[PDB]
Amino acid sequence: SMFLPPPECPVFEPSWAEFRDPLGYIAKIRPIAEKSGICKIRPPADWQPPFAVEVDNFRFTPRIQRLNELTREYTLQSFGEMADSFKADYFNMPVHMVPTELVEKEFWRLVNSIEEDVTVEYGADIHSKEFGSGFPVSDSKRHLTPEEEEYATSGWNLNVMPVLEQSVLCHINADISGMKVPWLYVGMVFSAFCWHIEDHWSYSINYLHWGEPKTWYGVPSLAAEHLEEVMKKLTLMNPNTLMSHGVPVVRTNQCAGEFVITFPRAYHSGFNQGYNFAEAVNFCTADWLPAGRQCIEHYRRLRRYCVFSHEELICKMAACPEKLDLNLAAAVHKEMFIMVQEERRLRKALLEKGITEAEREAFELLPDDERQCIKCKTTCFLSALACYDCPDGLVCLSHINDLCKCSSSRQYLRYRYTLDELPAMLHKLKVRAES
Ligand SMILES: CCN(/C=C\N(C)C)C(=O)CNCc1cc(C(=O)O)ccn1
Ligand SMILES: [Mg+2]
Ligand SMILES: [Mg+2]
Ligand SMILES: [Mg+2]
Ligand SMILES: [Mn+2]
Numbered sequence: 486s487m488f489l490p491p492p493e494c495p496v497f498e499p500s501w502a503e504f505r506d507p508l509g510y511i512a513k514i515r516p517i518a519e520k521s522g523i524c525k526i527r528p529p530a531d532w533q534p535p536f537a538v539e540v541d542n543f544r545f546t547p548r549i550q551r552l553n554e555l556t557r558e559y560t561l562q563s564f565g566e567m568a569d570s571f572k573a574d575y576f577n578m579p580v581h582m583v584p585t586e587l588v589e590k591e592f593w594r595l596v597n598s599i600e601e602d603v604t605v606e607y608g609a610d611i612h613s614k615e616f617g618s619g620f621p622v623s624d625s626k627r628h629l630t631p632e633e634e635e636y637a638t639s640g641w642n643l644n645v646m647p648v649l650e651q652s653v654l655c656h657i658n659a660d661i662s663g664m665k666v667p668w669l670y671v672g673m674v675f676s677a678f679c680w681h682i683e684d685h686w687s688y689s690i691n692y693l694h695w696g697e698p699k700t701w702y703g704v705p706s707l708a709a710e711h712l713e714e715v716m717k718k719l720t721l722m723n724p725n726t727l728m729s730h731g732v733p734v735v736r737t738n739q740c741a742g743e744f745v746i747t748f749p750r751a752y753h754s755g756f757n758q759g760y761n762f763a764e765a766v767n768f769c770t771a772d773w774l775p776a777g778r779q780c781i782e783h784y785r786r787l788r789r790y791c792v793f794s795h796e797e798l799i800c801k802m803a804a805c806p807e808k809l810d811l812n813l814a815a816a817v818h819k820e821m822f823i824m825v826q827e828e829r830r831l832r833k834a835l836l837e838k839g840i841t842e843a844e845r846e847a848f849e850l851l852p853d854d855e856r857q858c859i860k861c862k863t864t865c866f867l868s869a870l871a872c873y874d875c876p877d878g879l880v881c882l883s884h885i886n887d888l889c890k891c892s893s894s895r896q897y898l899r900y901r902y903t904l905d906e907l908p909a910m911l912h913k914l915k916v917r918a919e920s
């Protein structure tokens with residue numbers, strides 16, 4: 486049989502009232518939408534931000550994609566001309582007369598076709614800092630119309646959403662670009678993105694500025710490990726293969742002017758129906774905090790580097806309880822409580838090993854490469870073990886036996902807070918959450 490389209494993902498059409506608070510709205514729809522992993526949001530009809538990129542000074546070198554296996558520079562105009570001619574020539578139809586179902590069926594046939602070499606190009610992962618965002622920004626080099634200044638401050642503006650009140654990553658003001666600053670995607674027909682989840686299992690929000698639709702596939706976070714097991718066992722991967730192995734999949738065609746939200750640890754993939762322009766950014770919420778906690782341990786097991794420290798994030802929020810709504814205060818206290826108990830255990834174990842010397846360290850002021858456990862590559866914040874005779878070495882307190890062979894008298898504790906200081910932080914959170 487030909488490709489079977491998965492069931493359609495949920496589509497949300499917020500009122501103007503609902504639309505005022507993006508993170509509030511997303512929190513509201515989450516119980517339904519997280520059952521699907523992705524969802525589509527259609528803004529009120531007259532919410533229409535003018536495209537802000539200066540088209541004539543936008544240049545890029547797209548990546549080469551051969552469809553059955555997962556280099557000139559272009560301008561936006563010349564990429565589009567190439568894109569349209571390719572589609573019209575391949576389908577032998579007018580460029581805007583090809584049904585999305587037809588493109589979709591042919592895409593998945595091609596991905597699995599060893600004999601045919603269809604190759605396309607994708608302007609993927611373009612920094613919005615390089616040429617500007619698709620959305621207007623306040624401090625722009627462009628004279629903003631009154632209309633554009635309002636869109637510049639909108640919470641649904643992807644430059645603004647990650648620094649909103651209840652956007653948790655705003656508390657880490659280390660730059661960590663790639664998570665806080667939007668990325669651009671210039672697509673042509675068949676240009677694709679493989680199955681993945683976001684850094685630190687964060688949300689992503691995705692907006693299609695213009696062009697032909699972007700076709701999405703999404704998997705609920707609950708089925709994340711099952712998907713990974715199916716892929717390991719049988720091996721990008723056809724959604725039909727996933728569904729026939731017990732993994733739920735949804736689909737959608739994201740049209741111009743529509744948002745797509747990917748929820749924490751929701752696997753997603755897709756391809757573009759034609760020439761288009763999209764913008765995306767990560768964000769993190771109160772309800773994401775447990776996923777963030779778990780992702781650190783997942784990274785640890787994999788010896789992957791962290792973009793940021795979960796410990797540091799929790800403690801920075803805990804230090805300012807009055808900036809937290811009751812939902813966030815509760816979530817932070819939950820995380821903080823077990824962090825403190827683990828730290829009490831780890832420091833006790835350190836004393837039993839014989840280490841007695843200790844120095845206070847403001848880890849958040851160090852570069853990441855001076856913060857990483859040499860064993861599990863995690864970013865230290867609350868504490869670390871170092872050695873006076875081995876200056877390059879550093880381990881987190883979960884790995885005090887993996888620093889060096891020197892005697893206990895030459896090793897010392899580097900700590901952010903004393904054990905005494907931590908109950909006070911917990912108590913302040915608890916009082917706040919009890920308001
Ligand atoms: C927030 C965007 N971002 C930022 C880091 N990348 C540059 C690696 C991402 O990784 C998004 N994840 C990849 C992706 C790509 C697309 C796309 O090409 O349309 C759609 C959804 N997800
Ligand atoms: Mg417009
Ligand atoms: Mg939990
Ligand atoms: Mg857990
Ligand atoms: Mn993504």
Ligand SMILES: [Zn+2]
Binds near residue numbers: 860861862880
């Ligand atoms: Zn470690």
Ligand SMILES: [Zn+2]
Binds near residue numbers: 875895
């Ligand atoms: Zn040593």
